[PDB]
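Need Exo-beta-1,4-glucanase's 3D structure for a figure. Predict it.
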Amino acid sequence: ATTLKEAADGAGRDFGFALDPNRLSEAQYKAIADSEFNLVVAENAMKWDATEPSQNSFSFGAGDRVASYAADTGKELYGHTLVWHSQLPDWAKNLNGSAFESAMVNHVTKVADHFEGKVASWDVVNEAFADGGGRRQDSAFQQKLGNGYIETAFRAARAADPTAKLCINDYNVEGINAKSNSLYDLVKDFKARGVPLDCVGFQSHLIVGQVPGDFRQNLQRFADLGVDVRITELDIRMRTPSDATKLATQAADYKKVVQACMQVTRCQGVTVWGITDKYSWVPDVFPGEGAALVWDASYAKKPAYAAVMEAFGA
Ligand SMILES: O[C@@H]1[C@@H](O)[C@H](S[C@@H]2CO[C@@H](S[C@@H]3CO[C@@H](S[C@@H]4CO[C@@H](O)[C@H](O)[C@H]4O)[C@H](O)[C@H]3O)[C@H](O)[C@H]2O)OC[C@H]1O
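Structure prediction for Exo-beta-1,4-glucanase:
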């Protein structure tokens, strides 16, 4: 292999990136997108704010651009995300009771129908759980609809799209902890009762030098419930600026994550949350942190690149 795409292809797994379709007009960004990944997810273009800016009025141009990119380059398309407490328009927050439930159901139905046969897998529900266990405490869905909204969303997604893989996705669930235990309980319950659910996403927004040692064990216990697993939003952030020590640790960390996936037969692959440090979401949220991705801000491969290639078995 001479590319990460070749390494993942050869391993029989997915290696994906989060796309901003506006950056396709930057040729260096597009060149790396085209050659280094076999899967694409929309970083933002398929979220609720980007797709349904007023009630039952849809704006699919940006999401269509991502889908067309996937089809034109022969990449798998991953859908992110139907139901999420963040990036939720005010019009939806202003609804309550059955009117809010109906807005959720309609959003799920219209977006899944629109992309049916193009999107292969959906994050149907994103970030439902709380650090420390139990349900998220600042969610319009949890607050307005209670526990049952997750099952409602999954059943509605399956009613719209009979074949797509339907995933639940979360962060800080890479290790075995109260949060991943709550997620595990739900997955086991859904499978037991025949609620549509095919996959679990592990965002893997990690900090340099802090990869959970029980990541593989955790992925495996989920796979053993009868679902696929995936690393969905990988990045590994450090204090900026980078130096040799930090870049070496980061490379080792990327290798640990990709190896954990390789070691679980039903781990579909790894998606990184962007291409270049130039555009990473990290510095805006975490002051003085960054350099989290595989390419630096001038599109040079970082040591993480060779580590990913090695971990895929190339
Ligand atoms: O105006 C919008 C603008 O809001 C967005 S900016 C957008 C935000 O979403 C990020 S993806 C990011 C990834 O991490 C997860 S989990 C996160 C991990 O660290 C924890 O301690 C944090 O508290 C958690 O939130 C986040 O939930 C998720 O938001 C995108 O990459 C950014 O682009 O852009 C579009 C504009 O129209």
